[PDB]
């Protein structure tokens, strides 16, 4: 057991394990989003790429949390990972709305863990979240919001055409 | 005071100080235009970039006037800077129309100062405006006119789509 | 409006807009300080350069705040910018004392916004100030203090000579 | 005679010849200033260099006027060149005051020729002065004013010491 643990509450330890589960589930959701847009009957490569990149980012977030858990002397505990909430994700607009909802949920879990850390006077935990997660999340949510607005402007006009142009001229492919 | 001042009227000195104020207010207006197009619910990066670039150009114009004021032995006097005339700037078309109006106003102030300099037989002032401002202004107004025509052609067709395409295919991003 | 805003109080939003105004006014003050030292009857190039550099830094601070305001889903609102408090700034010593007073005022506004953010449990805001402003401000104020001491030591001795040597041998030109 | 002359008045032709004489006399004055500061009992190398550089600049100004005279089909006419007004030039401060007076005199002759050209509707002449002389003169006079202020600040304090420091730390050597 732990010869190193210092100022690391059982409450934070458990919440970090829950947050790892939430990041891995987000990664899984993004994997499903990504492969949906690779279907021959959907075929939006840029959209596929955008969500596959987010699957990787979320998995890396989970790995960084696990590394931190060990650095503090806590013990990683893994739970089952729930499948994503949908099997088909609709249009680019539907998908980007679902992604923003998911990110807001992750952001709220980060903020809740920051508050717990503040309450338990665990500055290392607070700084770790500040330095590696909170600003990344704000930037991502802003980028998703920007995308949502641009998609909305395009598919109001003419939906098929608008969806193609967004994929071609905004997303990387 | 001034050991160097020669052939530099009090009338020109004062008008140069007023023109500095007008350039700084134009810079401020462009700062507001730029950040409006960066809002998550507007999200036209190219448009944002175009106006941020103009904010910088106008500030540089003011600095060049101040440098000249000191080179001639006049004394810079700063006044309050009025906030921009709007808090929200509408569509790309609305914004480009407002920008052309602003530029025409600055161009008229340059022409009025050139006329004062001519009347006061101040060739250094006249040449300074000719060399650093009058042609820059004509070129900018032509570019804005070109943009306005292209935006008009696009948003007559289909407004959301047209605004996106102009931002993607004309403006630098 | 905002699809992205999360954990961002109206109180912080307003205070960020006020802080933008304070940074822009500081930039304006530094512009005036800089051009005063470029006058032919003052003629201290290093001093001019030092304050022009600070005008740029403060403007960049304002732009970073505006970027953050949009990233969080707040709305930039601009007010009139008050002219600087003086038209002439006296000696290098007078000017450096005025600059330290101004910086302390900006530092206090940063600390007050940090306290508001702490009270509203907005860790992103707190970290943003910590990461981009609070240490920059401490370093600048230390540098100004160092300068003030050196100027004082020089102009006690022999004021004209001392002011020239400080400009030549301390400030970059 | 002239197969090329067009729109070039006899009045301008004569005034250009007088201006050549004034530039050559200024060059001669600067030659004398320069060698005075090279005397073993004056020995301010930077000051010597500053005035020798101005002797060259003024000679080049005269050559450019002569080139222009031929380009327009006028005929260069040379007169005697009056010796400089002093044989010894006093201190750096005395010398810099004499130089500013001389430059103001040259600037006034340029402005008077510009006015003649304007009155005779000779835009080539007006532009030639604007492009090659008027801004050069304003910049030089500003630089001399800056120097005068710095010398004054130094030799008020302690004259010998101040004169040495200006030569060492401001002027190029
Ligand atoms: Cl499930
Ligand atoms: Cl107003
Ligand atoms: Cl005020
Ligand atoms: Cl004589």
Three-state secondary structure along chain B?
CCCCCCCCCHHHHHHHHHHHHHHHHHHHHHHHHHHHHCCCCCCCHHHHHHHHHHHHHHHHHHHHHHHHHHHHCCCCCCCCECCCCCCCCCCHHHHHHHHHHHHHHHHHHHHHHHHHHHHCCCHHHHHHHHHHHHHHHHHHHHHHHHHHHHHHHHHHHCHHHHHHHHHHHCCCC
Strand partners, C81: B81
For residue A46, the number of C-alpha atoms closer than 13 Å in the C-beta half-sphere is 14
Q: Tell me if B103 sits within 8 A of B140, measured CB to CB.
A: yes
Phi, psi of C3, deg, nearest 5: -80, -10
Q: Tell me if A97 sits within 8 A of A148, measured CB to CB.
A: yes
- Note the Cα B54 to chain centre separation in Å: 7
What distance in Å separates the CA atoms of residue B146 and residue D165, rounded to the nearest whole number? Answer: 58
User: Is residue A119 classed exposed, middle or buried when 0-12, 13-18 and 19+ CB atoms within 10 A define those classes?
Assistant: exposed
- Note the Cα D122 to chain centre separation in Å: 24
What distance in Å separates the CA atoms of residue A81 and residue A95, rounded to the nearest whole number? Answer: 21
Residue A17 lies in a domain: yes
Tokens of D105: 């005199």
Tokens of D3: 């197969």
Q: Diameter of chain C by CA atoms?
A: 63
Strand partners, B81: C81
Contacts of C among chains (3+ CB pairs under 8 A): A, B, D
Residue given tokens 């500081």 in the structure block: C26
> Residue C132 CB: number of other CB atoms within 10 A?
14
- Phi/psi-derived region of residue A3, left when phi > 0, alpha when psi is between -120 and 50, beta in every other case: alpha
Residue given tokens 């004055």 in the structure block: D29
Resolution in A: 1.6
Phi, psi of C4, deg, nearest 5: -110, -15
Radius of gyration of chain A (CA): 18
Q: Which of A100, A115, A148 sits opposite C121 (nearest CB)?
A: A115
Name the nearest CA neighbour of A34 among A18, A47, A21: A47
Q: Which of A104, A118, A135 sits opposite C124 (nearest CB)?
A: A135
Tokens of B134: 């009058």
The H or E element spanning position C96 is helix C92-119
Distances (CA, A) of A92 to B45, B77, D2: 20, 55, 79
Q: Which of C43, C159, C160 sits opposite D146 (nearest CB)?
A: C43
Contacts of A76 (CB under 8 A, 6+ apart): A17, A20, A66, A69, A70
Name the nearest CA neighbour of C47 among C2, C106, C89, C86: C89
User: Is residue D82 classed exposed, middle or buried when 0-12, 13-18 and 19+ CB atoms within 10 A define those classes?
Assistant: exposed
Q: Show residues of chain D in contact with B126, CB under 8 Å.
A: 130
Instruction: Among B2, B123, B132, pick the best mutation site for testing chain D contact (most D Cβ within 10 A).
Output: B123
Q: Can you tell me whether residue C121 is helix, strand or coil?
A: coil
What distance in Å separates the CA atoms of residue A141 and residue C71, rounded to the nearest whole number? Answer: 8
Residue C1 lies in a domain: no
Tokens of D36: 């005075």
Contacts of A121 (CB under 8 A, 6+ apart): A7
Q: Tell me if C151 sits within 8 A of C92, measured CB to CB.
A: yes
Q: Can you tell me whether residue D120 is helix, strand or coil?
A: coil
CA distance C127 to chain A (A): 6
Is there an interface between D and C (3+ Cβ pairs < 8 A)? yes
Q: Tell me if C125 sits within 8 A of C113, measured CB to CB.
A: yes
Burial letters for D14-39: b for 16+ Cβ neighbours within 10 Å, e otherwise? ebbbebbbbbbbbbbbbbbbbebbee
Radius of gyration of chain C (CA): 18
> Residue B125 CB: number of other CB atoms within 10 A?
24
Contacts of A among chains (3+ CB pairs under 8 A): B, C
User: Is residue C146 classed exposed, middle or buried when 0-12, 13-18 and 19+ CB atoms within 10 A define those classes?
Assistant: exposed
Q: Diameter of chain A by CA atoms?
A: 63
For helices D135-157 and D159-169, angle between their N-to-C axes, nearest 10 degrees = 140
Query: Do the annotations mark residue C56 as ligand-binding?
Result: yes
Q: Tell me if A48 sits within 8 A of A37, measured CB to CB.
A: yes
What distance in Å separates the CA atoms of residue B99 and residue B51, rounded to the nearest whole number? Answer: 9
CA distance B3 to chain D (A): 7
Contacts of D55 (CB under 8 A, 6+ apart): D27, D28, D30, D31, D33, D34
Contacts of B81 (CB under 8 A, 6+ apart): B21, B24, B25, B28, C28, C80, C81, C83
Q: Tell me if C23 sits within 8 A of C62, measured CB to CB.
A: yes
Residue A4 lies in a domain: no
User: Is residue B6 classed exposed, middle or buried when 0-12, 13-18 and 19+ CB atoms within 10 A define those classes?
Assistant: middle
- DSSP annotation of C60 reads H
Radius of gyration of chain D (CA): 18
Residue given tokens 């999340």 in the structure block: A137
Residue D5 lies in a domain: no
Tokens of B10: 């009090």
Q: Tell me if B84 sits within 8 A of B29, measured CB to CB.
A: yes
- Please give the torsion angle defined by the CA atoms of residues D111, D113, D115 and D119, in that order, rounded to the nearest 10 degrees: -170
The H or E element spanning position C94 is helix C92-119
CA of D82 to the centre of ligand 4 (A): 5
> Residue A79 CB: number of other CB atoms within 10 A?
11
Task: Give the residue ranges of DSSP H helices in D3-78.
Answer: 10-37, 45-72
User: Is residue C70 classed exposed, middle or buried when 0-12, 13-18 and 19+ CB atoms within 10 A define those classes?
Assistant: buried
Distances (CA, A) of D105 to B136, D26, D78, D111: 34, 10, 20, 10
Phi, psi of C133, deg, nearest 5: -125, -45
Contacts of D81 (CB under 8 A, 6+ apart): D21, D24, D25, D28
Residue C2 lies in a domain: no
| Residue-range definition of the domain harbouring residue B39 | 10-170
Name the nearest CA neighbour of B166 among B54, B53, B27, B50: B50
Instruction: Among B48, B49, B158, B161, pick the best mutation site for testing chain A contact (most A Cβ within 10 A).
Output: B161
Residue in chain D closest to C45 (alpha carbons) equals D146
Q: Show residues of chain B in contact with C60, CB under 8 Å.
A: none
Q: Can you tell me whether residue A39 is helix, strand or coil?
A: coil
Residue given tokens 């850390």 in the structure block: A117
Residue given tokens 């022409």 in the structure block: B111
Phi, psi of A64, deg, nearest 5: -70, -40
What distance in Å separates the CA atoms of residue B39 and residue A17, rounded to the nearest whole number? Answer: 36
Residue given tokens 């000191």 in the structure block: B70
Instruction: Among D157, D159, D167, pick the best mutation site for testing chain C contact (most C Cβ within 10 A).
Output: D157
What distance in Å separates the CA atoms of residue C38 and residue C33, rounded to the nearest whole number? Answer: 9
User: Is residue C43 classed exposed, middle or buried when 0-12, 13-18 and 19+ CB atoms within 10 A define those classes?
Assistant: buried
Kindly tell me the sign of the dihedral angle through the C-alpha atoms of D4, D6, D9, D14.
negative
The H or E element spanning position C137 is helix C135-157
Q: Tell me if A154 sits within 8 A of A166, measured CB to CB.
A: yes
Closest listed ligand to the CA of A25: 1
Residue given tokens 């400009």 in the structure block: C167
What distance in Å separates the CA atoms of residue D62 and residue D21, rounded to the nearest whole number? Answer: 8
What distance in Å separates the CA atoms of residue A145 and residue A138, rounded to the nearest whole number? Answer: 11
Residue given tokens 């009090």 in the structure block: B10
CA angle centred on C128, ends C122 and C132, rounded to 5°: 160
> Residue D89 CB: number of other CB atoms within 10 A?
24
Q: Show residues of chain C in contact with D165, CB under 8 Å.
A: 161, 164-165, 168
Interface touch B4/D134, C-beta < 8 Å? no
What distance in Å separates the CA atoms of residue B52 and residue D50, rounded to the nearest whole number? Answer: 43
> Residue C41 CB: number of other CB atoms within 10 A?
16
Please give the method by which this entry was determined: X-ray
Tokens of A126: 């607070």
- DSSP annotation of D121 reads T
Q: Diameter of chain B by CA atoms?
A: 63
Residue A15 lies in a domain: yes
CATH number at residue D100: 1.20.1260.10
CA distance B74 to chain D (A): 11
CA of C163 to the centre of ligand 4 (A): 41
Q: Can you tell me whether residue C81 is helix, strand or coil?
A: strand
Q: Tell me if B4 sits within 8 A of D142, measured CB to CB.
A: yes
Phi, psi of C91, deg, nearest 5: -90, 175
Contacts of A164 (CB under 8 A, 6+ apart): A44
Q: Tell me if D9 sits within 8 A of D122, measured CB to CB.
A: yes
Kindly tell me the sign of the dihedral angle through the C-alpha atoms of D91, D93, D94, D100.
positive
Tokens of A2: 């732990």
Residue D81 lies in a domain: yes
Task: Give the residue ranges of DSSP H helices in A4-158.
Answer: 10-37, 45-72, 92-119, 123-129, 135-157
Q: Tell me if D27 sits within 8 A of D62, measured CB to CB.
A: yes
Counting the structural domains of chain A, the total is 1
What distance in Å separates the CA atoms of residue D29 and residue D32, rounded to the nearest whole number? Answer: 5
What distance in Å separates the CA atoms of residue D173 and residue D165, rounded to the nearest whole number? Answer: 12
Q: Diameter of chain D by CA atoms?
A: 63
What distance in Å separates the CA atoms of residue D160 and residue D114, rounded to the nearest whole number? Answer: 43
Name the nearest CA neighbour of D67 among D118, D132, D119: D132
CA angle centred on C145, ends C140 and C148, rounded to 5°: 125
Residue C4 lies in a domain: no
For helices C135-157 and C92-119, angle between their N-to-C axes, nearest 10 degrees = 160
Interface touch D135/B123, C-beta < 8 Å? no
User: Is residue B80 classed exposed, middle or buried when 0-12, 13-18 and 19+ CB atoms within 10 A define those classes?
Assistant: middle
């Amino acid at each position: 057991s732990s010869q190193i643990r210092q100022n690391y509450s059982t409450e934070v330890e458990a919440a970090v394990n829950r947050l790892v589960n939430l990041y891995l589930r987000a990664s899984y959701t993004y994997l499903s989003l990504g492969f949906y847009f690779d279907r021959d009957d959907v075929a939006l490569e840029g959209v596929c790429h955008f969500f596959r990149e987010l699957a990787e980012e979320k998995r890396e977030g989970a790995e960084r949390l696990l590394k931190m858990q060990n650095q503090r002397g806590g013990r990683a505990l893994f739970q089952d990972l729930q499948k994503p909430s949908q099997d088909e994700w609709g249009t680019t607009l539907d998908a980007m709305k679902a992604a923003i909802v998911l990110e807001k949920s992750l952001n709220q879990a980060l903020l809740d863990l920051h508050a717990l850390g503040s309450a338990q006077a665990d500055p290392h935990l607070c700084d770790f979240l500040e330095s590696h997660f909170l600003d990344e999340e704000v930037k991502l949510i802003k980028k998703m919001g920007d995308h949502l607005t641009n998609i909305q402007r395009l598919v109001g006009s003419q939906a098929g055409l608008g969806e193609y142009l967004f994929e071609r001229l905004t997303l990387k492919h």
